[PDB]
Design an enzyme around this catalytic site. Sequence first.
Site, short mmCIF file in Angstrom:
data_model
loop_
_atom_site.label_atom_id
_atom_site.label_comp_id
_atom_site.label_asym_id
_atom_site.label_seq_id
_atom_site.Cartn_x
_atom_site.Cartn_y
_atom_site.Cartn_z
N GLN B 12 43.09 52.70 42.93
CA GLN B 12 43.49 52.27 41.59
C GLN B 12 45.01 52.31 41.45
O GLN B 12 45.61 51.45 40.80
CB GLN B 12 42.86 53.17 40.51
CG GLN B 12 41.35 53.20 40.53
CD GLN B 12 40.73 51.93 39.98
OE1 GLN B 12 41.44 50.96 39.69
NE2 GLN B 12 39.41 51.92 39.82
N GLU B 110 40.76 41.98 35.56
CA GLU B 110 41.41 41.67 36.84
C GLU B 110 40.34 41.75 37.89
O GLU B 110 39.96 42.83 38.34
CB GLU B 110 42.55 42.66 37.15
CG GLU B 110 43.69 42.07 38.01
CD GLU B 110 43.42 42.14 39.50
OE1 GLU B 110 43.33 41.08 40.14
OE2 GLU B 110 43.30 43.26 40.05
N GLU B 119 34.55 40.15 46.96
CA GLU B 119 33.99 41.17 46.07
C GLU B 119 33.08 40.50 45.05
O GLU B 119 32.12 41.10 44.56
CB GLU B 119 35.12 41.95 45.38
CG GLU B 119 36.25 42.39 46.34
CD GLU B 119 37.49 42.85 45.62
OE1 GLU B 119 37.42 43.03 44.38
OE2 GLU B 119 38.54 43.02 46.28
N1 LIG Z 1 30.23 45.15 36.88
C1 LIG Z 1 31.22 46.03 36.69
N2 LIG Z 1 31.13 46.90 35.63
C2 LIG Z 1 32.12 47.83 35.41
N3 LIG Z 1 33.21 47.88 36.26
C3 LIG Z 1 33.30 47.03 37.30
C4 LIG Z 1 32.32 46.09 37.54
N4 LIG Z 1 32.68 45.39 38.65
C5 LIG Z 1 33.87 45.88 39.09
N5 LIG Z 1 34.27 46.90 38.27
C6 LIG Z 1 35.48 47.73 38.33
O1 LIG Z 1 36.62 46.97 37.96
C7 LIG Z 1 37.76 47.38 38.68
C8 LIG Z 1 38.34 46.17 39.40
S1 LIG Z 1 40.06 46.45 39.89
C9 LIG Z 1 40.61 46.39 38.17
C10 LIG Z 1 41.33 47.67 37.76
C11 LIG Z 1 42.02 47.62 36.39
N6 LIG Z 1 41.23 46.88 35.41
C12 LIG Z 1 43.39 47.00 36.50
O2 LIG Z 1 43.55 45.85 36.10
O3 LIG Z 1 44.36 47.61 36.97
C13 LIG Z 1 37.29 48.47 39.62
O4 LIG Z 1 37.53 49.71 39.00
C14 LIG Z 1 35.80 48.30 39.70
O5 LIG Z 1 35.20 49.56 39.89
#
Ligand SMILES: Nc1ncnc2c1ncn2[C@@H]1O[C@H](CSCC[C@H](N)C(=O)O)[C@@H](O)[C@H]1O
EC number: 2.1.1.319
Lengths: 349, 350
Positions: B12, B110, B119
């Site tokens: 993160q 994001e 992903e």
């Molecule tokens: N279906 C889902 N429900 C909740 N979280 C999800 C998800 N799919 C992916 N994520 C989460 O979303 C993040 C993607 S990376 C985004 C990190 C943060 N929003 C930023 O912009 O800095 C990761 O933490 C992943 O665990």
Amino acid sequence: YFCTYSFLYHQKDMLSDRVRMDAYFNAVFQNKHHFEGKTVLDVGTGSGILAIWSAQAGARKVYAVEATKMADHARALVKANNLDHIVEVIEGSVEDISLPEKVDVIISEWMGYFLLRESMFDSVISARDRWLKPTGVMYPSHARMWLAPIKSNIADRKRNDFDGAMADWHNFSDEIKSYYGVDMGVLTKPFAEEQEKYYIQTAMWNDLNPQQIIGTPTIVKEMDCLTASVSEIEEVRSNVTSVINMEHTRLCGFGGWFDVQFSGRKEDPAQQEIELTTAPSEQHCTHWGQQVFIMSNPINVEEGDNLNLGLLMSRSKENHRLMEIELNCEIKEASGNPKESFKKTYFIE
Amino acid sequence: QYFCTYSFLYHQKDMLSDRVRMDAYFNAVFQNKHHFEGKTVLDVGTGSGILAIWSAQAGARKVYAVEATKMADHARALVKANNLDHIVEVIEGSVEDISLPEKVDVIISEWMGYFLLRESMFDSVISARDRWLKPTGVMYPSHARMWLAPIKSNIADRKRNDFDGAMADWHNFSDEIKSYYGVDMGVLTKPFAEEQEKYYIQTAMWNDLNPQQIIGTPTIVKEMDCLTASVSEIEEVRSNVTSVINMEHTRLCGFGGWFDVQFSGRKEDPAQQEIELTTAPSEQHCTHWGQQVFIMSNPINVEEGDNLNLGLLMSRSKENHRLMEIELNCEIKEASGNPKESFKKTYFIE
Ligand SMILES: Nc1ncnc2c1ncn2[C@@H]1O[C@H](CSCC[C@H](N)C(=O)O)[C@@H](O)[C@H]1O
Ligand SMILES: Nc1ncnc2c1ncn2[C@@H]1O[C@H](CSCC[C@H](N)C(=O)O)[C@@H](O)[C@H]1O
């Protein structure tokens, strides 16, 4: 797990271990009486290497069980070497397969990092209790885990890597406070814990040196593969190791390794007992090395000093194939009995 | 396998350390607080909760921050410690199994992986849009875009010198296994080989390309409207053509792919200002996605006006749906049509 074992590339790594390879080699051929005209089940054959030697040494029939598509290669390999008339390579998880007959010998190489990592012996138990006739042999026949206090410069590398980690996290949160205007202070602690758990708390693959061991080694668990069970796999042990140096050494951590033995049944002995050890050596490395358990806080220690150790070794909840080591240590001077008590959780992943 | 990584503050952290990516999102919001002033926001995959925080800072009415991972714990503490818990509601769960106290004006997230599509986190955003977004709703970003472009890179040598190393090491290994142990490893020479080509050659590398390393005209392979894009739209066929520019004389060593993202809002609610986040070759701008490189098995000479007729077909792998496969079919035709030199290679993104 099964994933990485499906690569030729990974399989040859193992096969590249001259030390690992010599032992199984000599265990089979130096004891071709357990094999001559007998039935063997090679547990987790992979390349099918051990299952070829058994045929090569007299085995009437050899069931080579492999859970991965690696089975398809063990076939080409057993066929390409002309033993396809002896060895039957079956793909699938030994837990799920049925054999035509009971088996004289169970041969496997199930040993992991610190012996118990991967818990593949759980599969061998299944195989033995489901198939090994009342009078079967097992290769290896016994195993053994060792621990010993060591002195490594790695203790400091990892403390210097954690400290840096921590130094960066504080610039970064300053950066994110200046731009963006979010204050990241309260994730300092969780980012601390996650970091001590990774540079400090988690066992290291190291290739120790006889000169790095600073006390008498202890045996933390003996084993009999003919009789061990899963229930005895999660294990508790208490023993003592004594300092032999000037000492003019420090306690920087503990190394752990394992012994294995091909001895036979107390009643169908080995004509010749073969030993696969991983004990540090100046010359004989194994792909297992040793597991170094790094000291959060190095400690001075003199000769005669007496380290009472309390180990507790449970398989993790998230993933039963990983280990978690509880290590209580009460140090006592030659003279009874000051101390330097402490307790630490290390992770084998 | 997938989610595991995101439960790591350290990871993160990497992303939050990416200035280009932050500057983009941060500006997207604050240059447009007119979508956020008093609005309801849904943040999908909040992580640290950074986007939720900004939205709330931009005057949102209430923000919805959904994370699947135990990371939801820390976004939750990170939002309390910045006096925004009365606006931000961090929820723990998958945006697929979660229901909402209402519909949402803005969906910001994001969700872009390597080459945009890895992903496959967009499947979750879509779902989030379809169930929760209101007609008026806006989305951040509002469009995406994957590019491809023929390149010149010494890594296509690096990998084949790597492969050859691998092969050499095997033939010794096998010879050493026959000398001692009395097994011949010969029947495994080919399979060993393919594994090593699959792994050094056909597998996409992360790279940080220089704009100079682009020896032909780039091409758009896919363009995305996040408002309407379907999940089925997500397995992609694309036939492009590219023309060699440098082309006085160079060598074709592989392909680069990258993506653009745009924050333009909606045609009936447009951004006060459009922001962009690109991962193209930079010289001065780095990103944590960098560029994906697809090596040439065998490099080919090339000149001015030489025409690369590419047939692409993006799809997910059967094993994992979060990984990609790329069947790249290539017809090359000199400026004087033709004659030819056509090849076909499937590349793996992991
Ligand atoms: N279906 C889902 N429900 C909740 N979280 C999800 C998800 N799919 C992916 N994520 C989460 O979303 C993040 C993607 S990376 C985004 C990190 C943060 N929003 C930023 O912009 O800095 C990761 O933490 C992943 O665990
Ligand atoms: N339950 C199970 N059933 C079948 N194979 C298993 C198994 N558990 C582990 N294995 C396999 O056993 C192998 C152990 S590594 C040992 C390789 C080979 N026997 C040698 O000594 O060179 C791996 O290939 C793994 O896929």
